[PDB]
Coordinates of C-alpha atoms (C1' of nucleotides) and ligand atoms in Angstrom, one line a residue:
Chain A
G74 CA 25.0 -24.5 46.6
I75 CA 25.6 -27.6 48.6
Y76 CA 29.3 -28.7 49.1
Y77 CA 30.5 -32.2 50.2
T78 CA 33.2 -32.3 52.9
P79 CA 35.5 -35.4 52.5
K80 CA 34.7 -38.1 54.9
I81 CA 38.2 -38.3 56.3
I82 CA 38.0 -34.6 57.4
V83 CA 34.5 -35.0 58.8
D84 CA 35.5 -37.8 61.0
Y85 CA 38.5 -35.9 62.2
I86 CA 36.4 -32.8 63.1
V87 CA 33.8 -34.9 65.0
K88 CA 36.5 -37.0 66.8
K89 CA 38.3 -33.8 67.7
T90 CA 35.4 -32.4 69.6
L91 CA 34.0 -35.6 71.2
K92 CA 36.9 -38.0 71.8
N93 CA 37.3 -37.0 75.4
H94 CA 33.7 -36.1 76.4
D95 CA 32.8 -37.5 79.8
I96 CA 29.4 -39.0 79.0
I97 CA 28.9 -40.2 82.6
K98 CA 29.5 -36.7 84.1
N99 CA 27.3 -35.1 81.3
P100 CA 25.0 -37.5 79.3
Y101 CA 23.2 -34.5 77.7
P102 CA 25.7 -32.9 75.4
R103 CA 24.4 -30.5 72.8
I104 CA 26.1 -30.9 69.4
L105 CA 25.2 -28.4 66.7
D106 CA 25.9 -27.8 63.1
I107 CA 24.5 -24.5 61.8
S108 CA 25.3 -25.5 58.2
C109 CA 24.3 -29.2 58.5
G110 CA 23.1 -29.5 55.0
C111 CA 22.2 -33.2 54.4
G112 CA 24.0 -34.1 57.6
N113 CA 27.6 -34.9 56.6
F114 CA 28.7 -34.0 60.1
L115 CA 25.5 -34.7 62.1
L116 CA 25.1 -38.3 60.9
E117 CA 28.7 -39.1 62.0
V118 CA 28.0 -37.4 65.3
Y119 CA 25.0 -39.8 65.8
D120 CA 27.4 -42.8 65.3
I121 CA 30.0 -41.4 67.7
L122 CA 27.3 -40.7 70.3
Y123 CA 25.6 -44.1 70.0
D124 CA 28.9 -45.9 70.7
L125 CA 29.6 -43.6 73.6
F126 CA 26.2 -44.2 75.3
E127 CA 26.2 -48.0 74.5
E128 CA 29.7 -48.5 76.0
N129 CA 28.7 -46.9 79.3
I130 CA 25.0 -47.9 79.3
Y131 CA 25.2 -49.8 82.6
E132 CA 27.2 -47.1 84.3
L133 CA 24.5 -44.6 83.3
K134 CA 21.8 -47.0 84.4
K135 CA 23.4 -47.3 87.9
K136 CA 24.1 -43.6 88.4
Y137 CA 20.9 -42.2 87.0
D138 CA 17.3 -43.3 86.3
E139 CA 17.8 -47.0 85.7
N140 CA 14.5 -47.2 83.7
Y141 CA 15.6 -44.4 81.4
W142 CA 19.0 -45.7 80.5
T143 CA 18.7 -48.8 78.3
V144 CA 20.2 -49.6 74.9
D145 CA 16.8 -49.6 73.3
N146 CA 16.3 -45.9 74.5
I147 CA 19.7 -44.6 73.2
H148 CA 18.3 -43.6 69.8
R149 CA 15.4 -41.5 71.2
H150 CA 17.6 -39.8 73.7
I151 CA 20.2 -38.7 71.1
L152 CA 17.6 -37.1 68.9
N153 CA 15.7 -35.5 71.7
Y154 CA 18.6 -33.9 73.6
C155 CA 21.9 -34.2 71.7
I156 CA 21.8 -33.5 68.0
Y157 CA 20.9 -30.1 66.6
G158 CA 21.1 -28.8 63.1
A159 CA 20.2 -25.8 61.0
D160 CA 20.2 -25.1 57.3
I161 CA 18.5 -22.6 55.1
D162 CA 17.7 -25.3 52.4
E163 CA 14.6 -27.2 53.6
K164 CA 15.2 -30.0 51.0
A165 CA 18.4 -30.7 52.8
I166 CA 16.7 -30.6 56.2
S167 CA 14.0 -33.0 55.0
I168 CA 16.6 -35.4 53.8
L169 CA 18.6 -35.2 57.0
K170 CA 15.4 -35.8 59.1
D171 CA 14.7 -39.0 57.1
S172 CA 18.4 -40.0 57.6
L173 CA 18.3 -39.5 61.4
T174 CA 14.9 -41.2 61.6
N175 CA 16.2 -44.2 59.6
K176 CA 19.2 -44.7 62.0
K177 CA 17.0 -47.0 64.1
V178 CA 14.3 -48.5 61.8
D179 CA 5.5 -45.0 64.0
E180 CA 6.0 -45.9 67.7
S181 CA 5.5 -42.4 69.3
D182 CA 6.4 -39.1 67.6
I183 CA 10.2 -38.7 68.1
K184 CA 11.1 -35.0 67.8
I185 CA 14.3 -33.9 66.0
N186 CA 16.0 -30.6 66.6
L187 CA 16.4 -29.5 63.0
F188 CA 15.7 -25.8 62.1
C189 CA 15.2 -24.6 58.5
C190 CA 16.4 -21.0 58.9
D191 CA 19.0 -18.4 58.3
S192 CA 21.5 -19.3 61.1
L193 CA 22.7 -15.7 61.2
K194 CA 19.2 -14.5 62.0
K195 CA 17.9 -17.3 64.3
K196 CA 17.1 -16.2 67.9
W197 CA 19.1 -19.0 69.4
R198 CA 17.5 -19.9 72.7
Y199 CA 20.5 -21.6 74.4
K200 CA 24.2 -22.3 74.0
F201 CA 25.8 -25.6 72.9
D202 CA 28.6 -27.9 74.2
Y203 CA 30.0 -28.8 70.7
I204 CA 29.7 -27.0 67.3
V205 CA 31.0 -28.6 64.1
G206 CA 30.6 -28.1 60.4
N207 CA 31.5 -26.4 57.1
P208 CA 29.9 -22.9 56.8
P209 CA 29.0 -21.2 53.5
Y210 CA 31.7 -19.1 51.9
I211 CA 30.5 -16.1 49.9
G212 CA 32.8 -13.2 49.0
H213 CA 32.0 -9.5 48.5
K214 CA 31.2 -9.8 44.8
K215 CA 28.8 -12.8 45.1
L216 CA 26.9 -11.7 48.2
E217 CA 23.5 -9.9 47.7
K218 CA 23.6 -6.2 48.5
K219 CA 20.5 -6.3 50.6
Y220 CA 21.9 -9.1 52.7
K221 CA 25.3 -7.4 52.9
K222 CA 23.6 -4.3 54.6
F223 CA 22.3 -6.6 57.3
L224 CA 25.8 -8.1 57.9
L225 CA 27.4 -4.7 58.0
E226 CA 24.8 -3.5 60.5
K227 CA 24.7 -6.5 62.8
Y228 CA 28.0 -8.3 62.3
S229 CA 30.3 -5.2 62.2
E230 CA 32.6 -6.8 64.8
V231 CA 33.9 -9.1 62.1
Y232 CA 32.3 -8.1 58.8
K233 CA 33.2 -4.9 57.0
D234 CA 34.6 -3.8 53.6
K235 CA 35.7 -6.8 51.6
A236 CA 34.9 -9.4 54.3
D237 CA 33.4 -12.8 53.6
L238 CA 30.2 -14.4 54.8
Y239 CA 32.0 -17.2 56.7
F240 CA 33.5 -14.5 59.0
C241 CA 30.0 -14.1 60.5
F242 CA 29.6 -17.9 61.0
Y243 CA 32.8 -17.8 63.1
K244 CA 31.2 -15.0 65.1
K245 CA 27.9 -16.8 65.5
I246 CA 29.6 -20.1 66.5
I247 CA 31.8 -18.5 69.1
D248 CA 28.8 -16.5 70.5
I249 CA 26.6 -19.6 71.0
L250 CA 29.4 -21.9 72.3
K251 CA 28.9 -22.9 76.0
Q252 CA 31.6 -22.1 78.6
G253 CA 34.0 -25.0 78.3
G254 CA 32.6 -25.9 74.9
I255 CA 34.6 -27.0 71.9
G256 CA 34.2 -25.9 68.3
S257 CA 35.8 -27.3 65.1
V258 CA 35.1 -26.2 61.5
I259 CA 36.7 -26.3 58.1
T260 CA 36.7 -22.9 56.3
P261 CA 38.9 -21.0 53.8
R262 CA 42.4 -20.4 55.0
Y263 CA 42.5 -16.8 53.7
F264 CA 41.4 -15.0 56.9
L265 CA 44.7 -16.2 58.6
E266 CA 46.6 -13.6 56.6
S267 CA 44.2 -11.4 54.7
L268 CA 43.7 -7.8 55.5
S269 CA 39.9 -8.3 55.6
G270 CA 40.3 -10.9 58.3
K271 CA 42.0 -8.6 60.8
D272 CA 38.9 -7.9 62.8
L273 CA 37.9 -11.6 62.7
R274 CA 41.3 -12.7 63.9
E275 CA 41.0 -10.2 66.8
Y276 CA 37.6 -11.6 67.7
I277 CA 38.8 -15.2 67.8
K278 CA 41.9 -14.6 69.7
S279 CA 40.1 -12.5 72.4
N280 CA 37.1 -14.8 72.9
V281 CA 38.3 -18.4 72.5
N282 CA 41.4 -20.5 73.0
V283 CA 42.6 -21.8 69.6
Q284 CA 43.6 -25.4 70.2
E285 CA 44.8 -26.3 66.7
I286 CA 45.1 -25.1 63.2
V287 CA 45.4 -27.5 60.3
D288 CA 46.6 -25.5 57.2
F289 CA 46.3 -27.3 53.9
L290 CA 47.8 -24.3 52.0
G291 CA 47.1 -24.8 48.3
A292 CA 46.1 -28.4 48.4
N293 CA 42.8 -29.2 46.7
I294 CA 40.6 -30.6 49.5
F295 CA 37.3 -30.0 47.7
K296 CA 37.4 -31.7 44.3
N297 CA 36.7 -29.3 41.4
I298 CA 36.5 -26.3 43.8
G299 CA 38.9 -23.4 43.6
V300 CA 39.4 -22.8 47.3
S301 CA 42.1 -23.4 49.9
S302 CA 41.1 -24.8 53.3
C303 CA 42.0 -25.0 56.9
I304 CA 40.6 -26.7 60.0
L305 CA 40.3 -24.6 63.3
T306 CA 39.6 -26.2 66.7
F307 CA 38.9 -23.8 69.6
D308 CA 37.4 -24.0 73.1
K309 CA 36.0 -21.8 75.8
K310 CA 37.9 -23.6 78.6
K311 CA 39.6 -21.9 81.5
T312 CA 43.3 -22.7 80.7
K313 CA 46.3 -20.8 81.8
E314 CA 48.6 -21.5 78.8
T315 CA 46.8 -21.1 75.5
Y316 CA 49.4 -22.5 73.1
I317 CA 48.2 -23.5 69.6
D318 CA 49.1 -26.7 67.7
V319 CA 49.8 -25.7 64.1
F320 CA 49.9 -28.5 61.4
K321 CA 51.2 -27.0 58.2
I322 CA 51.3 -29.2 55.1
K323 CA 54.7 -29.7 53.5
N324 CA 53.6 -30.7 50.0
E325 CA 50.4 -29.5 48.3
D326 CA 50.3 -32.4 45.8
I327 CA 49.1 -34.9 48.4
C328 CA 45.9 -36.8 47.9
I329 CA 43.9 -36.5 51.1
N330 CA 43.0 -40.2 51.3
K331 CA 46.6 -41.5 51.8
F332 CA 45.7 -43.1 55.2
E333 CA 42.4 -44.2 56.8
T334 CA 42.5 -41.2 59.2
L335 CA 43.6 -37.6 59.0
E336 CA 45.7 -38.1 62.2
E337 CA 48.0 -40.5 60.4
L338 CA 48.6 -37.8 57.7
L339 CA 49.2 -35.1 60.3
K340 CA 51.8 -37.0 62.2
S341 CA 53.5 -38.1 59.0
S342 CA 56.4 -36.5 57.1
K343 CA 53.7 -35.0 54.8
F344 CA 53.0 -32.3 57.5
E345 CA 55.1 -30.3 59.9
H346 CA 54.0 -29.4 63.5
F347 CA 55.0 -26.4 65.6
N348 CA 53.5 -24.4 68.5
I349 CA 52.5 -20.8 68.6
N350 CA 51.7 -18.8 71.8
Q351 CA 48.3 -17.2 71.3
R352 CA 49.3 -14.4 73.6
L353 CA 52.1 -13.4 71.2
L354 CA 49.7 -13.0 68.3
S355 CA 49.5 -9.4 67.0
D356 CA 46.9 -8.2 64.5
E357 CA 49.0 -10.5 62.3
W358 CA 49.2 -14.2 63.0
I359 CA 52.7 -15.2 62.0
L360 CA 52.5 -19.0 62.1
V361 CA 56.0 -20.4 61.3
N362 CA 58.4 -22.7 62.9
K363 CA 61.3 -21.5 65.1
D364 CA 63.8 -21.5 62.2
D365 CA 61.5 -19.2 60.1
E366 CA 60.6 -17.0 63.1
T367 CA 64.3 -16.5 63.9
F368 CA 64.9 -15.8 60.1
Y369 CA 61.9 -13.4 60.0
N370 CA 62.9 -11.5 63.1
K371 CA 66.5 -11.0 62.0
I372 CA 65.4 -9.3 58.8
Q373 CA 62.8 -7.1 60.5
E374 CA 65.3 -5.9 63.1
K375 CA 68.1 -5.3 60.7
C376 CA 66.0 -3.3 58.1
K377 CA 65.4 0.3 59.0
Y378 CA 63.1 1.2 56.1
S379 CA 60.0 -0.3 54.5
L380 CA 58.9 0.0 50.9
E381 CA 56.0 2.1 52.0
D382 CA 58.5 4.5 53.7
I383 CA 60.4 5.1 50.4
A384 CA 58.0 4.4 47.6
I385 CA 54.6 5.4 46.2
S386 CA 52.4 2.4 45.4
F387 CA 49.4 2.2 43.0
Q388 CA 47.1 -0.3 41.4
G389 CA 46.8 -0.5 37.6
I390 CA 44.1 0.7 35.3
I391 CA 40.6 -0.8 35.7
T392 CA 38.8 -0.2 32.4
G393 CA 35.7 -2.0 33.5
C394 CA 35.5 -3.8 30.1
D395 CA 38.8 -4.8 28.8
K396 CA 37.6 -6.1 25.4
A397 CA 36.3 -2.6 24.6
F398 CA 39.6 -0.8 25.3
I399 CA 42.4 -3.4 24.8
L400 CA 43.6 -4.3 21.3
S401 CA 46.4 -6.3 19.9
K402 CA 49.2 -4.0 18.7
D403 CA 48.8 -5.4 15.2
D404 CA 45.0 -4.9 15.1
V405 CA 44.0 -3.0 12.0
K406 CA 41.5 -1.0 14.1
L407 CA 44.4 0.9 15.7
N408 CA 44.8 2.8 12.4
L409 CA 41.5 4.6 13.5
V410 CA 43.1 5.7 16.8
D411 CA 45.5 8.6 17.0
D412 CA 48.6 7.5 18.8
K413 CA 48.3 10.1 21.4
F414 CA 45.5 7.9 22.8
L415 CA 47.5 4.7 22.7
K416 CA 49.4 3.2 25.6
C417 CA 51.5 0.1 25.9
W418 CA 49.7 -2.6 27.9
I419 CA 51.1 -5.6 29.7
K420 CA 49.7 -8.6 31.6
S421 CA 51.1 -10.3 34.8
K422 CA 52.8 -13.0 32.7
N423 CA 54.8 -10.3 30.9
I424 CA 56.6 -9.6 34.2
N425 CA 59.8 -11.5 34.8
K426 CA 62.5 -10.9 37.4
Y427 CA 64.2 -7.5 36.7
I428 CA 62.6 -6.7 33.3
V429 CA 59.3 -6.7 31.5
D430 CA 58.5 -8.5 28.2
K431 CA 57.8 -6.3 25.2
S432 CA 54.1 -5.5 25.2
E433 CA 51.8 -7.0 22.6
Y434 CA 48.7 -5.0 23.5
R435 CA 47.6 -1.4 23.4
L436 CA 45.2 0.5 25.7
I437 CA 43.0 3.2 24.2
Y438 CA 43.1 5.8 26.9
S439 CA 39.5 6.8 26.1
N440 CA 39.3 9.5 28.8
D441 CA 41.4 11.9 26.6
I442 CA 38.7 11.6 23.8
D443 CA 37.4 15.2 24.1
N444 CA 33.9 14.5 22.9
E445 CA 31.8 12.2 20.8
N446 CA 31.8 14.0 17.5
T447 CA 35.5 14.5 16.7
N448 CA 36.5 10.8 17.2
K449 CA 33.3 9.2 16.1
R450 CA 34.9 6.3 14.3
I451 CA 36.8 5.2 17.5
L452 CA 33.5 5.2 19.4
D453 CA 31.3 3.7 16.8
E454 CA 33.7 1.0 15.5
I455 CA 35.7 0.0 18.5
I456 CA 34.4 1.0 21.9
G457 CA 30.7 1.1 21.0
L458 CA 30.8 -2.6 20.2
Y459 CA 30.4 -3.1 24.0
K460 CA 28.3 0.0 24.8
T461 CA 25.6 -2.0 26.5
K462 CA 28.1 -3.6 28.9
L463 CA 29.9 -0.3 29.3
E464 CA 26.7 1.5 30.3
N465 CA 26.1 -1.1 33.0
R466 CA 29.3 -0.2 35.0
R467 CA 28.4 1.5 38.3
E468 CA 29.9 4.9 37.5
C469 CA 28.1 5.1 34.1
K470 CA 24.7 4.4 35.7
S471 CA 25.4 7.2 38.2
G472 CA 26.5 9.6 35.5
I473 CA 30.1 9.9 36.9
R474 CA 31.6 8.4 33.7
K475 CA 30.6 8.7 30.1
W476 CA 29.8 5.3 28.6
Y477 CA 33.0 5.3 26.6
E478 CA 35.4 6.4 29.4
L479 CA 37.6 4.1 31.5
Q480 CA 36.0 3.2 34.8
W481 CA 39.2 3.9 36.8
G482 CA 41.7 5.5 34.5
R483 CA 44.0 6.5 37.3
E484 CA 46.6 9.2 36.6
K485 CA 48.6 8.8 33.3
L486 CA 51.7 10.5 34.8
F487 CA 52.0 7.8 37.4
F488 CA 52.6 5.2 34.7
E489 CA 54.6 7.3 32.3
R490 CA 57.8 7.2 34.3
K491 CA 60.5 4.9 35.5
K492 CA 58.9 2.5 37.9
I493 CA 58.9 -1.0 39.3
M494 CA 56.2 -3.5 38.4
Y495 CA 55.2 -6.9 39.8
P496 CA 52.4 -9.4 39.2
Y497 CA 49.5 -9.4 41.6
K498 CA 49.6 -13.3 42.0
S499 CA 52.8 -15.3 41.5
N500 CA 54.7 -18.3 42.6
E501 CA 57.8 -16.2 43.4
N502 CA 59.1 -12.7 43.7
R503 CA 59.1 -11.0 40.2
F504 CA 59.9 -7.3 40.5
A505 CA 60.9 -5.6 37.2
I506 CA 62.1 -2.2 36.3
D507 CA 59.8 -0.7 33.6
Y508 CA 61.6 1.4 31.1
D509 CA 58.8 1.6 28.5
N510 CA 56.0 3.6 30.2
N511 CA 53.9 0.4 30.4
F512 CA 50.3 0.5 31.5
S513 CA 48.5 -2.5 32.9
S514 CA 45.3 -3.7 34.6
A515 CA 44.9 -4.6 38.3
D516 CA 46.8 -7.9 37.7
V517 CA 50.0 -5.8 37.8
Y518 CA 51.0 -3.4 40.6
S519 CA 53.5 -0.6 40.3
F520 CA 55.6 1.6 42.5
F521 CA 58.1 4.4 42.1
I522 CA 60.7 5.7 44.6
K523 CA 60.0 9.0 46.4
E524 CA 62.2 11.8 45.4
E525 CA 63.7 12.2 48.8
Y526 CA 64.8 8.6 48.9
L527 CA 66.5 8.5 45.5
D528 CA 70.0 9.2 46.9
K529 CA 69.6 6.2 49.2
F530 CA 67.8 3.6 47.1
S531 CA 68.0 3.0 43.3
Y532 CA 65.7 0.9 41.2
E533 CA 68.6 -1.3 40.3
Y534 CA 69.4 -2.0 44.0
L535 CA 65.7 -2.7 44.8
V536 CA 65.0 -5.3 42.1
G537 CA 68.3 -6.9 43.2
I538 CA 67.3 -7.6 46.8
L539 CA 63.6 -8.0 46.1
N540 CA 64.2 -10.7 43.6
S541 CA 66.8 -12.5 45.8
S542 CA 66.1 -16.0 47.3
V543 CA 66.3 -14.3 50.8
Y544 CA 63.5 -11.9 50.0
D545 CA 61.4 -14.5 48.2
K546 CA 61.4 -16.7 51.4
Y547 CA 61.1 -13.6 53.6
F548 CA 58.0 -12.3 51.8
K549 CA 56.3 -15.7 51.7
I550 CA 56.5 -16.1 55.5
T551 CA 53.6 -13.6 55.9
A552 CA 52.2 -13.5 52.4
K553 CA 48.6 -14.6 51.6
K554 CA 48.6 -18.1 50.1
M555 CA 45.9 -18.3 47.5
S556 CA 46.1 -21.6 45.6
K557 CA 48.7 -24.2 44.7
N558 CA 52.0 -22.4 43.9
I559 CA 50.2 -18.9 44.0
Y560 CA 50.7 -16.1 46.5
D561 CA 49.0 -12.7 46.4
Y562 CA 51.5 -10.0 45.7
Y563 CA 49.3 -7.0 46.8
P564 CA 50.5 -3.7 48.3
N565 CA 48.8 -4.4 51.6
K566 CA 51.6 -6.8 52.2
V567 CA 54.2 -6.0 49.5
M568 CA 54.6 -2.4 50.8
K569 CA 55.3 -3.8 54.3
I570 CA 58.5 -5.4 53.0
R571 CA 61.5 -4.0 54.9
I572 CA 64.8 -3.1 53.2
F573 CA 68.3 -2.2 54.3
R574 CA 71.4 -0.2 53.3
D575 CA 75.0 -1.2 54.2
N576 CA 78.5 -1.8 52.9
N577 CA 77.2 -4.3 50.4
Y578 CA 75.0 -1.8 48.6
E579 CA 77.4 -1.0 45.8
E580 CA 78.2 -4.6 44.9
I581 CA 74.6 -5.7 45.1
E582 CA 73.5 -2.9 42.8
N583 CA 76.4 -3.6 40.4
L584 CA 75.4 -7.3 40.2
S585 CA 71.8 -6.2 39.5
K586 CA 72.9 -4.1 36.6
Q587 CA 74.9 -6.9 35.1
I588 CA 71.8 -9.2 35.4
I589 CA 69.7 -6.5 33.7
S590 CA 72.3 -5.9 31.0
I591 CA 72.5 -9.6 30.2
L592 CA 68.7 -10.0 30.3
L593 CA 68.3 -7.2 27.7
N594 CA 71.0 -8.1 25.1
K595 CA 70.2 -10.2 22.0
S596 CA 72.4 -13.2 22.4
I597 CA 71.0 -13.7 25.9
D598 CA 72.5 -16.6 27.9
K599 CA 70.7 -17.0 31.3
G600 CA 73.5 -19.2 32.7
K601 CA 75.7 -16.3 33.9
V602 CA 72.6 -14.6 35.3
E603 CA 72.0 -17.6 37.7
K604 CA 75.6 -17.4 38.9
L605 CA 75.3 -13.6 39.5
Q606 CA 72.1 -14.2 41.4
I607 CA 73.8 -16.8 43.6
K608 CA 76.6 -14.3 44.3
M609 CA 74.0 -11.6 45.2
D610 CA 72.2 -13.9 47.5
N611 CA 75.4 -14.5 49.3
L612 CA 75.9 -10.8 49.8
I613 CA 72.4 -10.3 51.1
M614 CA 72.7 -13.2 53.5
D615 CA 76.0 -11.7 54.7
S616 CA 74.3 -8.3 55.0
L617 CA 71.4 -9.6 57.1
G618 CA 73.5 -12.0 59.1
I619 CA 71.6 -15.2 58.3
Chain B
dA16 C1' 36.1 -37.6 32.0
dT17 C1' 38.1 -34.9 36.4
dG18 C1' 42.4 -33.7 37.9
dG19 C1' 46.0 -30.5 36.9
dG20 C1' 48.2 -26.5 35.1
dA21 C1' 48.4 -21.6 33.1
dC22 C1' 46.8 -17.5 34.1
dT23 C1' 44.1 -13.7 35.8
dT24 C1' 38.3 -9.1 35.5
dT25 C1' 35.8 -5.7 37.3
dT26 C1' 32.9 -5.4 41.0
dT27 C1' 32.8 -3.2 45.3
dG28 C1' 33.1 -0.7 50.0
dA29 C1' 35.3 2.9 51.7
Chain C
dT203 C1' 36.3 12.1 43.7
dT204 C1' 38.9 7.9 43.4
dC205 C1' 41.6 4.6 46.0
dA206 C1' 42.6 -0.8 46.3
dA207 C1' 40.9 -5.9 47.9
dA208 C1' 38.7 -9.8 46.7
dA209 C1' 39.9 -16.8 44.8
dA210 C1' 33.5 -22.3 47.3
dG211 C1' 38.8 -18.5 41.2
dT212 C1' 38.1 -19.5 35.7
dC213 C1' 39.2 -22.0 31.7
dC214 C1' 41.3 -25.3 29.0
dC215 C1' 43.3 -30.1 28.0
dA216 C1' 44.5 -34.9 28.3
Ligands
QBU807 O1 26.9 -24.3 51.6 C1 27.0 -24.5 53.0 C2 25.6 -25.0 53.6 O2 25.1 -24.0 54.5 C3 23.8 -23.6 54.1 N1 23.6 -22.2 54.3 C4 24.0 -21.2 53.6 N2 23.7 -20.0 54.1 C5 23.1 -20.3 55.3 C6 22.6 -19.5 56.4 N3 22.7 -18.2 56.4 C7 23.3 -17.3 55.4 C8 22.4 -17.0 54.3 C9 23.0 -16.2 53.2 C10 22.0 -15.9 52.0 C11 22.5 -14.9 51.0 C12 21.5 -14.5 50.0 C13 20.5 -13.5 50.3 C14 19.6 -13.2 49.4 C15 19.5 -13.8 48.2 C16 20.4 -14.8 47.9 C17 21.4 -15.1 48.8 N4 22.1 -20.1 57.4 C18 22.0 -21.5 57.4 N5 22.4 -22.3 56.5 C19 23.0 -21.7 55.5 C20 23.7 -24.0 52.6 O3 22.3 -24.4 52.3 C21 24.6 -25.3 52.5 O4 23.9 -26.5 52.8
K808 K1 20.0 -46.0 89.3
K809 K1 43.5 -25.3 46.4

DNA sequence: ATGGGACTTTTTGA
DNA sequence: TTCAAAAAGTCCCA
């Protein structure tokens, strides 16, 4: 588990923290990487430091011990007092020690401050002027349970529930950064918007000044790695303004090596720059330009309801082993299953704007199987094919579920009604009215309108505005950006969407019903639908005053 | 190939 | 008892 940061980003991160260091005022800077690995960052730090000392060698010689400050002594001084590294992989440390040693190319026993340890457990004996690197990322599924108990116990300020391991590295880096120190790291971007990152965001904002955020959105920074990156630079300097530079990429299809340096890319048309006042950050960090902020605030102020106010949200079925319970609707095995047990089953791709595709799969709602003797053929010939994997689910091992039951079968009556469904990850808003009692896994979310809000909001009106170009832009302002052309559509944000009622209600709803009626007929022509959508977008923009 | 596009399971803490 | 979040996604092709 060793990952390579592209050289252009490494140089930017090191230059960011060291470009303005006053080596004459302080010729003993402590630069640390608690993830150093083989030394992607530290070896570049050595090069930057060596030039810095060499360019001012006579000034140091005059101001300080003139026998100590010579070009010949620069190498030894850097390793003794300046470069610090830590990594849990001793093979990586051994390689980095050879690399630092070979920078000069025994005389006398030069010591190198490299620690092979868990950086989250090391008793750090002092703080550091500059901290750079790329921490490990490990989510809640892939982190060992025994280790996770330690993080919950000792890193509770930033790590709880579905948090990530790199949250704790942010915590450690901030804690061991000197007063006036500067830190710069590349991490996943998700903590900027994710629900899990709320505590971490609060910790950063209240303990450091965030100088700069480079947000690569869905661009693929790490080749053959499914992750989305950002670069954060922060300091512990006494400043009275604390404004953040935000560099947000404009096109995710860029290759990172367009120029020789990352600065050229950031100042180019390929990025956009804007400023955010750190003191105006709430638990949410809404990092958008002034046009988007004006747009976002207009909608928030005009809308007196949220979806959570008026609707009941729920996540789909989690069977725990889909292959055991999900069959093609033309599978011959379904003749063994009484149709009282069978439900229509759709995937996220079956959701379009305003309507759902006809289902091609069936779910065996195995909870309603009374016992193991009356429906033996279903258990023996269909579900029992995966009995080993089924028995390994957590609730089966604890005895809460029978081996053939659905892990989280939810409540049938929630799905067997008129409701709205949307995919959990999509490039655009796709909210559909479900007329067919469709069930689904957790890749599709559903909601239905509360009974007391039915005389104010109809399903037809909701899919109308929710699928509009206005609401697509509006939702993406604060949505969690996952990968290229993919946003999370999860209730923790979808239910915070705000909605309105005014004089345009009837016409918006009527346009929605025409769209639905066209989308459902046989000789379907989408052309008029696009025109109707353009007209509805005009009404909505009129309604919200944008 | 390795870079790009289509599509999305069930484990898990609370 | 039972909710919903979580991409160092996953997998395939050219
Ligand atoms: O990938 C990023 C780089 O960072 C290094 N690293 C990874 N984790 C730590 C680290 N503490 C966290 C350790 C988490 C281990 C989780 C685990 C526990 C038990 C069994 C199994 C697992 N402390 C220092 N360096 C680290 C990698 O080696 C790598 O070079
Ligand atoms: K001197
Ligand atoms: K990406």
